[PDB]
Design a protein around this ligand. Structure first.
Ligand SMILES: C=C(C)[C@@H]1CCC(C)=C[C@H]1c1c(O)cc(C)cc1O
Length: 136
C-alpha cells in the first residue's frame, strides 16, 4: 500500500538545468531554480492527491484525481498548459503531460523513507529524491 502523504525535504536534484532547458526556460531562471531546495507537502486522500512544492519565494501546487485527465497549468515553471493524467502503475505514480513537448511526464515512488521523482521531457531526464521529515 503506497501512501505519499507526508512532509518531504529535498535531498538531491540531478540534472534539473538540462530538464528546464528542454522546456525552453531561459538560463537565468534555470540557475535560480536549480539553487532552490523546496519541500513537498503531500496529502493522498483516496485517489485525490494534493502535492504542494514549497519554497520561500516560489511555490507550485498540483491538485488532481488519480486516473482522471485534467488541464495542468504549469504557471511559474515553463508557463505551458498540458492535458495531464496521473495514473497508478503498481506502486508507482505515472504522470503523462500531453502538450507541445514530446515525452513530457514524471514518475513518483517511495523507497523506505525516500520519495523518488523522475521527470522527463524530449528524452532529457532529471531525478529528485526527498526525505520524509517530521518538523512542520
Ligand atoms: C520551488 C519551485 C516550485 C520552483 C519554481 C520555479 C521552477 C522553474 C521550478 C520549481 C522547482 C521544483 O519544482 C523542484 C525543485 C527541486 C526545484 C525547483 O526550483
Amino acid at each position: 500500500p503506497v501512501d505519499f502523504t507526508g512532509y518531504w525535504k529535498m535531498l538531491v536534484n540531478e540534472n534539473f538545468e538540462e530538464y528546464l532547458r528542454a522546456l525552453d526556460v531561459n538560463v537565468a531562471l534555470r540557475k535560480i531554480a536549480n539553487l532552490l531546495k523546496p519541500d513537498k507537502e503531500i496529502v493522498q486522500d483516496g485517489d485525490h492527491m494534493i502535492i504542494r512544492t514549497l519554497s520561500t519565494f516560489r511555490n507550485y501546487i498540483m491538485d488532481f484525481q488519480v486516473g482522471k485527465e485534467f488541464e495542468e497549468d504549469l504557471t511559474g515553471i515553463d508557463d505551458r498548459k498540458c492535458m495531464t493524467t496521473v495514473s497508478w502503475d503498481g506502486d508507482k505514480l505515472q504522470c503523462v503531460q500531453k502538450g507541445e513537448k514530446e515525452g513530457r511526464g514524471w514518475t513518483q515512488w517511495i523507497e523506505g523513507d525516500e520519495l523518488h521523482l523522475e521527470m522527463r521531457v524530449e528524452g532529457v531526464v532529471c531525478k529528485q529524491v526527498f526525505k520524509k521529515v517530521q518538523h512542520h
